[PDB]
Amino acid sequence: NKSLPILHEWKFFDYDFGSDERRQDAILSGEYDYKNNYPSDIDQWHDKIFVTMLRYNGVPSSLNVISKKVGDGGPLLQPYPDWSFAKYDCSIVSASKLAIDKCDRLWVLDSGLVNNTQPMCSPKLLTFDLTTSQLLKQVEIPVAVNATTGKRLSSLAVQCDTMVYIADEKGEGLIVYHNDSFHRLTSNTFDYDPKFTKMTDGTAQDGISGMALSPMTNNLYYSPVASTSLYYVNTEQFQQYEGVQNILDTQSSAKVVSKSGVLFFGLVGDSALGCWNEHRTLERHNIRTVAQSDETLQMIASMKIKEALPHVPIFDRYINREYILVLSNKMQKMDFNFDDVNFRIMNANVNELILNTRCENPDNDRTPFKISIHL
Amino acid sequence: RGESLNKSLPILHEWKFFDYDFGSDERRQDAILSGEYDYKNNYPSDIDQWHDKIFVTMLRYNGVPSSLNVISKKVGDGGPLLQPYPDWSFAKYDDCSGIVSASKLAIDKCDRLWVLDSGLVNNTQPMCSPKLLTFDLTTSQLLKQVEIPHDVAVNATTGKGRLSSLAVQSLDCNDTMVYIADEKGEGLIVYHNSDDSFHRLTSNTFDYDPKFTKMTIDGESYTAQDGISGMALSPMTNNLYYSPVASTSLYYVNTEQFRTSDYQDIHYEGVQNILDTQSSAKVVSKSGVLFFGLVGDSALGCWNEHRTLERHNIRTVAQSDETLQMIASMKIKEALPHVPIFDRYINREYILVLSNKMQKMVNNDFNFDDVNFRIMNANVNELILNTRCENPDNDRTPFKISIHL
Amino acid sequence: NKSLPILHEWKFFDYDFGSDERRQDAILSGEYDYKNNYPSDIDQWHDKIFVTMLRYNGVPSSLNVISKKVGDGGPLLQPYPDWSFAKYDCSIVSASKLAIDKCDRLWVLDSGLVNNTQPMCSPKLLTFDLTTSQLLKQVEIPVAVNATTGKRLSSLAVQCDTMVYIADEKGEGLIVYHNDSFHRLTSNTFDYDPKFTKMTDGTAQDGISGMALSPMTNNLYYSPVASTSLYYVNTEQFQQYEGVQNILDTQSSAKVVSKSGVLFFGLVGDSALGCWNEHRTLERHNIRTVAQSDETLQMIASMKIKEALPHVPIFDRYINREYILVLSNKMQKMDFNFDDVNFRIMNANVNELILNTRCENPDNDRTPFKISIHL
Amino acid sequence: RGESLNKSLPILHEWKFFDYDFGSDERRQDAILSGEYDYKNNYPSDIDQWHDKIFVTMLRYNGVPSSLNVISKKVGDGGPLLQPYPDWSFAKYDDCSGIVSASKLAIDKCDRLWVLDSGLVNNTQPMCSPKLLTFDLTTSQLLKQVEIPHDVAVNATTGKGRLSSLAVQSLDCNDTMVYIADEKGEGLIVYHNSDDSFHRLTSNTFDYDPKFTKMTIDGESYTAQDGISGMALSPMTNNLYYSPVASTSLYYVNTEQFRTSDYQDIHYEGVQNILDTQSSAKVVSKSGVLFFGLVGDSALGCWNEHRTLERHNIRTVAQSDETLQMIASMKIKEALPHVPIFDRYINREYILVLSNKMQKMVNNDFNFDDVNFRIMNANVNELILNTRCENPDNDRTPFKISIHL
Amino acid sequence: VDVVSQINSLVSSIVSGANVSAVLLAQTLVNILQILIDANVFA
Amino acid sequence: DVVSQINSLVSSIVSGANVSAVLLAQTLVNILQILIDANVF
Amino acid sequence: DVVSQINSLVSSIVSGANVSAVLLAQTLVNILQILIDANVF
Amino acid sequence: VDVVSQINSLVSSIVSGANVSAVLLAQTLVNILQILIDANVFA
Ligand SMILES: C=C(CC[C@@H](C)[C@H]1CC[C@H]2[C@@H]3CC=C4C[C@@H](O)CC[C@]4(C)[C@H]3CC[C@]12C)C(C)C
Ligand SMILES: C=C(CC[C@@H](C)[C@H]1CC[C@H]2[C@@H]3CC=C4C[C@@H](O)CC[C@]4(C)[C@H]3CC[C@]12C)C(C)C
Ligand SMILES: C=C(CC[C@@H](C)[C@H]1CC[C@H]2[C@@H]3CC=C4C[C@@H](O)CC[C@]4(C)[C@H]3CC[C@]12C)C(C)C
Ligand SMILES: C=C(CC[C@@H](C)[C@H]1CC[C@H]2[C@@H]3CC=C4C[C@@H](O)CC[C@]4(C)[C@H]3CC[C@]12C)C(C)C
Ligand SMILES: C=C(CC[C@@H](C)[C@H]1CC[C@H]2[C@@H]3CC=C4C[C@@H](O)CC[C@]4(C)[C@H]3CC[C@]12C)C(C)C
Ligand SMILES: C=C(CC[C@@H](C)[C@H]1CC[C@H]2[C@@H]3CC=C4C[C@@H](O)CC[C@]4(C)[C@H]3CC[C@]12C)C(C)C
Ligand SMILES: C=C(CC[C@@H](C)[C@H]1CC[C@H]2[C@@H]3CC=C4C[C@@H](O)CC[C@]4(C)[C@H]3CC[C@]12C)C(C)C
Ligand SMILES: C=C(CC[C@@H](C)[C@H]1CC[C@H]2[C@@H]3CC=C4C[C@@H](O)CC[C@]4(C)[C@H]3CC[C@]12C)C(C)C
């Protein structure tokens, strides 16, 4: 029953157009309607906090960072790298998901979708150098559609010879890229379950969507959106499965794994955050809920886990380095009340969240002090 | 109990057996031959801590050179050597002049060390009258010494007495109140610094229960017909928590009752038979968390004073069949120096735990090739975090530092 | 009889052309003959040490800095700002003298002369911003010639509304610029003396050349090259004189004044450095020689005085801040022996050089420590 | 002399008159009434310095509570109060037990403080026999005390004696050699630490010259028929420089002569009549620069040992008619701590100068509303830089730090 | 005053991987020390 | 061991004990050098 | 006065005396603040 | 070893007005301290 400290809040999103002159030119045009801006993913690198927006009608830029400027809605966004990549007339159409690797490359999953459905352009995977803010490589996703159903690239994971993984919730499959082959996989574990299609604050026929790669085991955990199961596939395989079914009491939302082997996941029904340690066996008595809030955790659309910096390995024993960033929009409302707070980036120290619970990693209490970190 | 089996606390000091800094191995051997120092008869009663000093008190059996000690820089095959405090002058009791058996210790806001000398030898034969000493820790010199009158040191009918527990309430650094439990005689002495007055209280809550007289620790068991001990004053509520040794209850008395004179109808509170086993020593954090040793389980339990006193608010926070066999003492300290502006960044409170093996003393059957006496420690907040014992966490800084020694 | 610590030495000058390929292309061409490279002025700003070269035949660049690279001759030079300003075909022809002001502007006196005589282009005063390495202003010197004799801008001083002063040794006059008027002045004190035209290691009919502005008194000290006198003119005057004549026993070379009011000057005959405090009266018993060396101080062609940085005025009492940089070429040899050391930049702490001599400023010994600085 | 008229040295401590830390103004007044302390009769003989202590020795006239002192933290209308060293125990001479009149001090490599107690009262009447004390500065306790036998303390024919100068040669920190000038009796005592042996030497170089017996300081003049004083041992050459008080000469004796025994034909060196006025106290830097006070000019002069001893190598380095009237003492110290790798960055040596006004003592005509006694100081290298006294400067670093107190 | 928000801000920079202002580092070091001085940490 | 020095030093500080200036200096030296070697600057 | 503190402190150090940790800390604080205010960083 | 040439180099940078390397500053601080430690400056 923890609340997690808020890092950023919004009543609604707004952007740094330049002057209030240049904003009003966009409002009248319908380039920017505040009522249609919904965040898809967040991430963090140095001083930058990325926020991606689902490209509906009235969404000026998709790939953004939070700026120094502030509005009545909350922190204004600012397109990344510049406004050049905000344009789609198929030039980033809709930055669905983000990922940052060991080498300071930012991977972006552009779905190509408009209103999250009509595919105006083909999907692609971009790769920016965060040191320069310039683009290193762009690749079209052919892999991209079911080849039978015909059907939304809605999850991403990246492994400095790197390997990317892209879930397709609508088409129900797993694209596997090699740094230049692509390959679509399929499974019944990737398919949606009709039983858990209804997610009742107060229906979605989507499959594989909620991926999370363990840095310690190399299992890519996942589940269909309509499911109460937790499946996984080992990635050492990556030319053609594990996990329990119906293990959770409600549907899971986004997912993330710590370097230390703790899997976190959002619990849709309870409006809570749950965890599970990979060292334990996947069963009910090892699944615990670690935070919950009826106001603040309504749909956990994204989670990332970062390590405190700089990384000086000799001092690791003194520091609980890992912390979690949580995007909690209100997908249930996507009929909003824009006089209230709707979109939140929360955070917390990982170890503080699970300590003295079945989720914890074993504590060697071998120093007179331990420092817990977050932002 | 959950999610905490075999969770041990980091060791600060270990011993196979106690030994002292006599000077050189010449001066030691002079004492071994004399019978002043037999290593097999040294059993620790209490610990405490102030600045660089860690106090260790020894039950004065035959072969125990000093009772009131500190841990020294020197080290032996047994473990850290002890060194009498203040000097060897207070180790002597042929004279019957100063300190026979430092049963318990307490340190107050003003850097005074309070010592409960029982006067007992072999924990039974009262060679001298009990007394309460008060040293100035800044100087290592004695400020005051007071005899505990036989009037209140023993039960009047039976004549029995063993002063086994101590707690101090420094109200104003100058009007302090001491509290002394008598487990054998079954009473609560209440001393006043202003008058040097004493007052012995009685209650059925101070009496031993025959039902819970058998206590099993690590296979071996023994029997103890003892009452009130394991005292602990809450700095936040002023409740002096206690229980009879042979009991599974947690009682308490509010001490505001003792402030206004004329009490000598006192009101005792607390649940009976609330624990599954007997409780040993006890301590309360400034933040209102009560810790207590669970004799049977060889565990440490807690309970927050903010919650209601019942089973569903009692949790066991550490347990170890090897390391926690009899928790004979516990103290809680705040990290120093105290810079209040930075309190928000720091979990300041930590716990020190003396865990001898009283079960092995009873039967006179120790294995001195093994580790027997341990001072463990831990950060209070880290021990209770995400448990029913915790205080509500304001997560208001990008970092939090947990401290112990 | 002090020697001063050497900061940089040369047997001969050489440049950073790029590769030894690009050097050899210039040697063959006659763009760079090592035997014709003679330094005119030095200066210093942050990590840069400026070295200006008299533009004879075989001198690739005139305005240079010392580079990180090294040759058999000594530190290679590198044109400032880039090779763009090394070109003259009248685009810097010959950077005769330099000066740095309070605001980090570098003033350059381009004479326009080739072989120090034939005026290929008109003289000019450039002004670079040292923060950017870019040019702020360029001005042609009309003022520039005698208007009767017809005749070499060979001395410079700069006072953030700034005032520049340019001596003309050949034409015998003093140009005064206002930050945009110019104005040539004349005097018999600016004229050469035939008596001291011969400067005998083992003849020059030149006038005003050896200027030095006192930061404390605003006197611009000077003398004709052929003279043994020390004249001066107050600059508060600056629309149409002071100092003793024949006060020195031999001819003076370059000149510089400390912020603290000590005038330094090279003594041609003795191959020495002399000083004189402005607080004392200008006469023989107040003139002292502070350093001398038959090898190292043969012609003091330039001197500058800098203050140690950063400038934190509260701590001035702890620090002898001022130090002197001395260019000592061998103008007597301008018949050189290029297997020997010919051009030297020496330095020293000002206060250490004059302490307990008639040149010193009064010492308040009011701290348990005093730090002496140079490079 | 040139380029240095009225150049003064920064004052470290000033006095209008000396006063002591008796305890409180209660305890002072008890001594004033007694005649133990008259402020008008306190005249400083020597200074020295070790760590935080500045020693100040007082000529034991009537009304001088202690002879061997340090400067205290307390301050009076006269100036810094003095405080007896080690304690008041050594201030007493009714008993004749310890320290009558600490004439001179010396500190050696091993942190021993050597004290030359003359035994004189009013600088004339020998109430007790002279002695040489040796305290350990680390402990403030006394290591050794030795009487100077009447055999060598006085001239055998005339019987006169006044031990007025001291120098110490710590050869090995354990075999040290002390040297004690006797200005009245005209001799040089040479003591050996190994034997406790003494040997009195004589020479015409030790004798007073009637020609230079009149010394004028700041208008007022007096007359002094005194010989050998103003000693100073060179740490680099082992020459013990000296001169008779009534003389304008600078003599010296090499001390390697005294190393090999059997001397008691000794060879004395140095120019005669080399100065225009009389020299007062003397000191030599480790670097080989000899400093000396010039009585007539009220100046400080120097001479480098590397140069030849003659007029053109002697320069006056500071002078002041107010502040330098009689240079009664000088010492040279190196800045600490000593970190040899950084020696190149630091002019380590500095000079301490006691400048009382002996001219005003002679005539018993002080003005105690004025400043009378001064401890000045300066960096050695800064004082002699660009003068004939300097040692050659290797200018090999971008910075050089000059030190004094 | 307001050392807490400076500290919080600065540590957040450091742990985030960002480049950290030397002046903010110096000023916060100055303020932490002075606080410690005033709390007799060195006395 | 840098770790044992750190542990020892912090234990002193938090215990209220007087803290060794040499242990303080040496541990500061070792932490810095570690940070230097990790390109922290 | 920062100057009097500096003078006092350096005199201690060079004299061989034990040197006050509080005077050291406070003077370090004042030198830094001066440097901060002079845009030295 | 060769702390002297590092010191000389570093101070020359500082006094010249140049920007000064944080790593050279840190390393030279480390070396000066260690020298002082080995000379019992803190003992
Ligand atoms: C209590 C404090 C401040 C404590 C400060 C010095 C703590 C806090 C966080 C620490 C960094 C955390 C992680 C890390 C990651 C590790 O890899 C290097 C150390 C570093 C940067 C810590 C350094 C020390 C920090 C800044 C004041 C109020 C007295
Ligand atoms: C992580 C580190 C070192 C971290 C150091 C600076 C931390 C640790 C403990 C902190 C004190 C704890 C309590 C306290 C109690 C509080 O009252 C004052 C701060 C103080 C003393 C902390 C100061 C900062 C300390 C010493 C290295 C290895 C990179
Ligand atoms: C003796 C030393 C090094 C001493 C160091 C700290 C000295 C030397 C020069 C000083 C700067 C000079 C001028 C100045 C100009 C003044 O405005 C600010 C201080 C500064 C930069 C000095 C700072 C202190 C410096 C760097 C080691 C070997 C123990
Ligand atoms: C200019 C400064 C402060 C300069 C400080 C760091 C200087 C001054 C004296 C130096 C010591 C002198 C001698 C010595 C003797 C030598 O043996 C060790 C260095 C030491 C202690 C110097 C260390 C550096 C000191 C303290 C501020 C006002 C900007
Ligand atoms: C600017 C910083 C670093 C702050 C650092 C230098 C501060 C913090 C606490 C200080 C120690 C506290 C107590 C003590 C106890 C005292 O006995 C010695 C100093 C020491 C260890 C302090 C030294 C300096 C510390 C570690 C962060 C915010 C990036
Ligand atoms: C001796 C100490 C105190 C250790 C202190 C001075 C250490 C610890 C961490 C260091 C910072 C790490 C990162 C950083 C981030 C980097 O950008 C600047 C330096 C800084 C702040 C380090 C400086 C020094 C710190 C604060 C303890 C053990 C008692
Ligand atoms: C307390 C002290 C020591 C004072 C020391 C830490 C001060 C003095 C000068 C400072 C540097 C000045 C310039 C600079 C140049 C700048 O670029 C970096 C900081 C630095 C090196 C300053 C840092 C701190 C210094 C060395 C004395 C009085 C005993
Ligand atoms: C990196 C620097 C600055 C070096 C500075 C921090 C060093 C130098 C000497 C140190 C003091 C020496 C003695 C002592 C005496 C000792 O008792 C306390 C420390 C102190 C004052 C040292 C502290 C730190 C000093 C000032 C320069 C080269 C830019």
Numbering used by the authors:
A (entry chain B), C (entry chain B): 28 to 116, 118 to 119, 121 to 171, 174 to 182, 184 to 191, 195, 200 to 218, 221 to 241, ...
B (entry chain A), D (entry chain A): 23 to 196, 200 to 289, 292 to 432
E (entry chain D), H (entry chain D): 36 to 78
F (entry chain C), G (entry chain C): 37 to 77
What does the paper say about this structure?
Because, the sequence homology between MRJP1 and any other protein of known three-dimensional structure was <17%, the structure were determined by combining multiple isomorphous replacement and molecular replacement methods, and refined to a resolution of 2.65 Å in space group of H32, with an Rwork of 23.9% and an Rfree of 27.5%. The asymmetric unit contains two MRJP1, two apisimin, four unexpected 24-methylenecholesterol (ostreasterol, Osl), and 144 water molecules. The overall complex adopts an H-shaped structure with approximate height, width, and length of 100 × 50 × 115 Å, respectively. It has an apisimin-dependent dimerisation of MRJP1 dimers quaternary structure, comprising 16 molecules, including four MRJP1, four apisimin, and eight 24-methylenecholesterol molecules. MRJP1 is folded into a unique six-bladed β-propeller shape containing 31 β-strands and 11 α-helices with a central channel. Three disulfide bonds (Cys132–Cys195, Cys118–Cys150, and Cys329–Cys416) were observed in MRJP1, with the last one stabilising the C-terminal portion. Each apisimin molecule in the asymmetric unit contains two α-helices connected by a loop, with two hydrogen bonds and a large hydrophobic zone between the two α-helices, giving apisimin a relatively stable 47° oblique structure. For the inner two Osl molecules, each is totally enveloped by two MRJP1 molecules, one apisimin, and the other three Osl molecules. Apisimin functions as a dimer joining the protein complex, stabilising the complete MRJP14-apisimin4-Osl8 tetramer. Interestingly, electron density for N-acetylglucosamine (NAG) was observed at glycosylation site Asn144 in the crystal structure.
RJ contains 12–15% protein, of which 82–90% are members of the major royal jelly protein family (MRJPs) that share high homology, and are designated MRJP1−95–7. Besides their nutritional role, MRJP1 is a key factor responsible for honeybee development. Interestingly, the MRJP1 oligomer reportedly comprises both MRJP1 and apisimin. Apisimin is a serine-valine-rich peptide exclusively found in honeybee and has the tendency to form oligomers.
